[PDB]
A paper describes a structure:
The nematode Caenorhabditis elegans has two genes that are annotated as β-carotene 15,15′-monooxygenase (BCMO) and are 17 centimorgan apart on chromosome II, but the function of BCMO-1 and BCMO-2 remains uncharacterized. Sequence homology indicates that the two enzymes belong to the carotenoid cleavage dioxygenase family that share a seven-bladed β-propeller fold with a nonheme iron center. Here we determined crystal structures of BCMO-1 and BCMO-2 at resolutions of 1.8 and 1.9 Å, respectively. Structural analysis reveals that BCMO-1 and BCMO-2 are strikingly similar to each other.
The full-length BCMO-2 was produced in same way as for BCMO-1, and was crystallized and diffracted to 1.9 Å. BCMO-2 has one molecule in an asymmetric unit and comprises 39 β-stands, 5 α-helices and 9 310-helices. Compared with BCMO-1, two 310-helices (η3 and η4 in the loop connecting α1 and β9) are not observed due to missing density for residues Pro103–Gly122. Residues Asp390–Ser392 from the β27–β28 loop and residues Leu430–Glu436 from the β31–β32 loop are not observed either. The β31–β32 loop hosts Ser435, the only insertion in BCMO-2 (530 residues in total) relative to BCMO-1 (529 residues). The RMSD value between BCMO-2 and BCMO-1 (chain A) is 0.39 Å for 429 Cα atoms aligned, indicating that these two structures are highly similar. The substrate tunnel of BCMO-2 passes through the helical dome. Its two ends are flanked by two unobserved fragments, Pro103–Gly122 and Leu430–Glu436, respectively. The second missing fragment hosts Leu430, the counterpart of BCMO-1 Phe430, and its lack of electron density allows the tunnel runs towards η9 and η10. The ligand bound to BCMO-2 was modeled as an imidazole, and the configuration of the BCMO-2 iron center was highly similar to that of BCMO-1.
Residue numbers in the entry: 1 to 102, 123 to 389, 393 to 429, 437 to 529
Amino acid sequence: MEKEGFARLFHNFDNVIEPKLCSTSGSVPSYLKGTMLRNGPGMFEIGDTKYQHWFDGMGFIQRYHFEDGKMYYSARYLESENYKKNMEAQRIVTGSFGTASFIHDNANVAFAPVGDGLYACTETPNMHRVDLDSLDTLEPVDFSKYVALHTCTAHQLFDENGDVYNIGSRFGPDAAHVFTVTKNPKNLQSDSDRSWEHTTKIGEIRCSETFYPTYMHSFGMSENYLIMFESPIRIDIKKFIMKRFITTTFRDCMKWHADKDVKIFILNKKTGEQVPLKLKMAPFFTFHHANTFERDGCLVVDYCRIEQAGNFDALLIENMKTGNFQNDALFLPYLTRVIIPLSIPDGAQPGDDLLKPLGWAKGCSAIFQKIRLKEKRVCDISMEFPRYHWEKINMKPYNYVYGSSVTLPGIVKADLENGDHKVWRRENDKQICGEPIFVPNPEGVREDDGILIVPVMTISDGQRPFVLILEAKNLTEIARYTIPEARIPLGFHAFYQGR
Ligand SMILES: [Fe+3]
């Protein structure tokens, strides 16, 4: 293992079974009491075989437990069927996003709450419940038992009732994006308070090109609508169905179709009917939607926009190892807003900007041609892993998005109202900020009355990783928990459970 560099983070991680008391500085308010689980890849080589892509590594879940003003750290591999088969063979024997083999249930991306249960997910129907304390891998769940689909996002969205929504893709001559709702099992007669049994298909929207469905990482949800982009990154289905004959991967069947505009698909959550508009915009890709809401007959969709991503060559392990392959400015994400009229007024003329009357929409336009949408950048400081104050303004007009940078910007708070953005600056270039999680003050009234939990990775053996606690109004540090391990993973998403 190197003393310095991103290569440090691609050596295999070891389990940390007994929760380790971390070193405290500062102090936290009484309402920081709960457990954050963080998902991501931890194992990048097995025996004589190595994974190719960042997204491939075996899921390695960390637990950051907050109690009595202290933090405790532990971490364990998800014991998926893939993990267990690979560990027994001592080689990479099951496929992954970007590596061919030498059931896809390596749920290394994020977590979905259903009732009182927490389910580790990847972009397949095959999930596992995980215990928030012991990090045991519990029962498997096959989401496709309830709705026929081949892939689905690991970014399920939920509402105040705890109902969980997702979009998946069903391949075939019929190819379609299927929109789903899973009713909270606590509010109905169910097998258990964590059962996925109340899952139905709301509706579906056919892919424009049956043999080139879009790749999709996330989507937006408002009070009445689910919205997705048909991105230029397309899965070559004919190539993919042959994968076991030509030794290829899912990622290698994806390409960015450079001559295609983006289409917007919108489904009414409650009617199940597609919004009957043809909506186009200039090409882009987004990993992560932020919040989504309705205002003045329009759907407002915020997201971190990437100009050009190919099929994610930039996130191959070899490319990230060097770190230097971060001078890819077309891959830098920016928080962006598009505003979509949900209807066209009688008498609209070609060239009319349907958003011109709406002063709050200035900077976006929606030109009647079909409607061509023009988005606007809402934060000039590049950011990714967006999060917001879900409890107060999910599906509602809102002011703030928190994200991570990827001089020395670390965490960014975008101000959608006035543009008074805030930044917590990293202390040196051996630090990397992870996804910030907003925890609300129970007695707060403003949208940013709360704190942020920020895991900070390091790429140097002279600096231990830590969890940073920021107050959310001005992003100043109020506490820091330094972890007695050499590394935490270059990970993906976290889930915080107050308790
Ligand atoms: Fe993600």
